[PDB]
Amino acid sequence: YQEPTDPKFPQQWYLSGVTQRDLNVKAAWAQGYTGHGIVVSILDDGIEKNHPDLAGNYDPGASFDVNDQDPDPQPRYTQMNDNRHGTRCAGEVAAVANNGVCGVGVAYNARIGGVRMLDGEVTDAVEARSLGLNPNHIHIYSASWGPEDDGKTVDGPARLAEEAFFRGVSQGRGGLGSIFVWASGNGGREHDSCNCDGYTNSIYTLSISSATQFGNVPWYSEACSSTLATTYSSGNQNEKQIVTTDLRQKCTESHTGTSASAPLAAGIIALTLEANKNLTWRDMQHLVVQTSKPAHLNANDWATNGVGRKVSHSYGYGLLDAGAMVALAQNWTTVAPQRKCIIDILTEPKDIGKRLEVRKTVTACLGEPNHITRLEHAQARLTLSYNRRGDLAIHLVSPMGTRSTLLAARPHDYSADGFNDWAFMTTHSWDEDPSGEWVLEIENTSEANNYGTLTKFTLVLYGTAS
Ligand SMILES: NC(=[NH2+])N/N=C/c1ccc(/C=N/NC(N)=[NH2+])cc1
Ligand SMILES: NC(=[NH2+])N/N=C/c1ccc(/C=N/NC(N)=[NH2+])cc1
Ligand SMILES: NC(=[NH2+])N/N=C/c1ccc(/C=N/NC(N)=[NH2+])cc1
Ligand SMILES: *[C@@H]1O[C@H](CO)[C@@H](O)[C@H](O)[C@H]1NC(C)=O
Ligand SMILES: [Ca+2]
Numbered sequence: 001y002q003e004p005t006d007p008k009f010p011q012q013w014y015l016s017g018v019t020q021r022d023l024n025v026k027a028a029w030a031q032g033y034t035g036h037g038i039v040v041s042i043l044d045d046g047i048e049k050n051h052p053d054l055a056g057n058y059d060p061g062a063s064f065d066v067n068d069q070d071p072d073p074q075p076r077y078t079q080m081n082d083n084r085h086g087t088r089c090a091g092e093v094a095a096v097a098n099n100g101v102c103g104v105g106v107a108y109n110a111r112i113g114g115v116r117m118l119d120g121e122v123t124d125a126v127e128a129r130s131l132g133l134n135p136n137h138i139h140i141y142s143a144s145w146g147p148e149d150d151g152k153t154v155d156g157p158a159r160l161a162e163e164a165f166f167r168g169v170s171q172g173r174g175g176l177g178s179i180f181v182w183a184s185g186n187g188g189r190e191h192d193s194c195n196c197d198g199y200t201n202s203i204y205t206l207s208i209s210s211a212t213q214f215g216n217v218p219w220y221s222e223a224c225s226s227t228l229a230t231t232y233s234s235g236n237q238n239e240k241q242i243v244t245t246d247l248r249q250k251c252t253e254s255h256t257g258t259s260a261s262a263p264l265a266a267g268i269i270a271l272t273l274e275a276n277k278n279l280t281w282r283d284m285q286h287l288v289v290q291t292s293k294p295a296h297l298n299a300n301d302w303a304t305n306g307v308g309r310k311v312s313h314s315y316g317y318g319l320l321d322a323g324a325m326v327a328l329a330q331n332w333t334t335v336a337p338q339r340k341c342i343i344d345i346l347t348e349p350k351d352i353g354k355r356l357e358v359r360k361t362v363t364a365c366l367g368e369p370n371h372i373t374r375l376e377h378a379q380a381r382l383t384l385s386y387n388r389r390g391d392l393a394i395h396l397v398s399p400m401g402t403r404s405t406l407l408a409a410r411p412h413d414y415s416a417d418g419f420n421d422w423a424f425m426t427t428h429s430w431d432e433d434p435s436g437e438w439v440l441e442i443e444n445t446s447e448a449n450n451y452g453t454l455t456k457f458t459l460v461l462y463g464t465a466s
């Protein structure tokens with residue numbers, strides 16, 4: 001193996017660095033993993049399939065134009081270059097290497113496609129037809145859309161899109177499951193809290209946040225318990241940004257935001273799948289939990305969970321480590337089939353008022369086929385009314401003492417509509433034994449005399465017993 005010679009590879013500090021502030025991708029390349037045989041699709045505004053740094057890896061079988069209903073995802077060219085984003089993301093994954101053009105993709109021998117689906121009216125059907133594209137050919141999907149990042153919206157996939165996620169992880173990729181890599185949001189300036197985004201809050205998406213070059217939480221980041229891990233992206237004007245392919249056969253040094261982090265993650269996951277093509281969608285999440293690195297990411301909420309891992313709501317388990325991912329993948333034993341233990345908690349509705357605490361001791365389906373002693377995701381599915389939704393903060397504590405923030409106060413969320421069986425999800429108790437006392441806390445963070453009622457609390461545990 002030889003270091004890439006592309007002219008901008010030295011500017012790709014998150015790959016080419018030698019000061020330990022990078023994604024450890026050279027180490028994976030040196031192990032012989034470059035993405036050969038893997039297929040990634042960018043679900044966004046299209047892909048410039050004739051870009052000199054994309055054409056060599058472009059895959060029509062990974063591509064479609066859902067907005068205009070044709071096979072050709074070429075972007076719509078406009079004076080402001082509005083439809084450049086999918087091309088930028090595609091190059092992050094699989095820009096061609098050693099060709100004298102721009103830089104390289106993380107998985108520079110993977111095949112890359114795009115679905116043109118954001119440049120038009122984005123319905124449930126449009127979303128579902130994109131998530132469900134060619135699921136026995138495409139291995140990995142990358143996406144960074146969802147409800148508006150205005151800090152007041154609560155929404156997620158409607159019926160067709162939710163069905164596409166369950167079909168993807170169940171029958172996709174030959175029954176191993178489509179890998180849906182997702183950005184956790186760009187609503188940081190609005191104080192958004194990303195479990196309110198049902199796409200990133202899903203267990204079926206492998207959710208990724210950002211870190212700046214100097215190791216800080218960027219202005220645009222959203223914190224939430226559903227995030228799994230982090231990749232580098234942009235920050236302040238003294239910090240470098242993401243360097244990649246751009247619309248009109250150009251090269252940019254100013255790709256930004258959490259939308260630039262998810263494609264880097266998708267590239268690392270492509271190297272990992274090359275190392276073990278038999279990994280399931282759940283295996284891949286386990287590998288991310290075990291190998292990601294907190295070191296040198298700055299956050300005031302790093303906490304040690306019940307199995308000794310550090311976790312943050314800004315960063316999940318930390319920075320992805322490509323060399324560690326591919327190394328651990330090679331001899332990985334497939335996890336056991338996924339169990340689901342449903343615990344309906346309340347015997348009566350509970351007044352919220354200023355503060356409500358609900359304690360429940362559970363056996364986690366002891367004696368049943370769905371008995372779980374090794375947790376993966378957990379959800380607190382809550383139904384409640386409240387007069388001003390954004391004044392609520394919600395926490396969930398596992399029996400091992402791990403305090404997951406399910407919802408932070410959102411100052412712009414004036415909604416009086418509450419939560420309707422909203423499945424707040426945490427990854428922070430992964431591999432814990434969920435038997436014992438769980439604690440739900442709901443608090444009014446305002447000095448206002450707010451009021452409401454909790455009418456349903458379902459604890460849903462996913463995982464295994466081995
Ligand atoms: N939860 C969220 N992730 N929300 N995402 C919101 C959102 C809003 C606008 C656009 C525009 N994209 N325009 C393009 N790609 N040319 C993309 C995403
Ligand atoms: N269930 C949901 N709320 N899905 N939301 C999907 C979604 C939301 C905003 C946008 C904006 N795009 N803006 C642009 N293309 N200029 C695209 C997709
Ligand atoms: N803004 C929204 N409208 N969100 N709605 C989301 C949502 C998600 C799944 C389903 C499934 N329904 N399945 C059935 N009815 N058998 C229904 C609604
Ligand atoms: C993939 O994993 C399954 C489950 O462990 C196993 O039965 C199968 O033999 C594996 N296939 C390959 C090609 O390793
Ligand atoms: Ca077209």
Ligand SMILES: [Ca+2]
Pocket residue numbers: 006053095096097098099100101102103104
């Ligand atoms: Ca190149």
Ligand SMILES: [Ca+2]
Pocket residue numbers: 147148149150184185186187192193194197222
């Ligand atoms: Ca958001």
Ligand SMILES: [Cl-]
Pocket residue numbers: 340
């Ligand atoms: Cl389920």
Ligand code: NA
Pocket residue numbers: 182199200201202203204205206207226
């Ligand atoms: Na997710």
Ligand code: NA
Pocket residue numbers: 303304305306400401402
């Ligand atoms: Na702890």
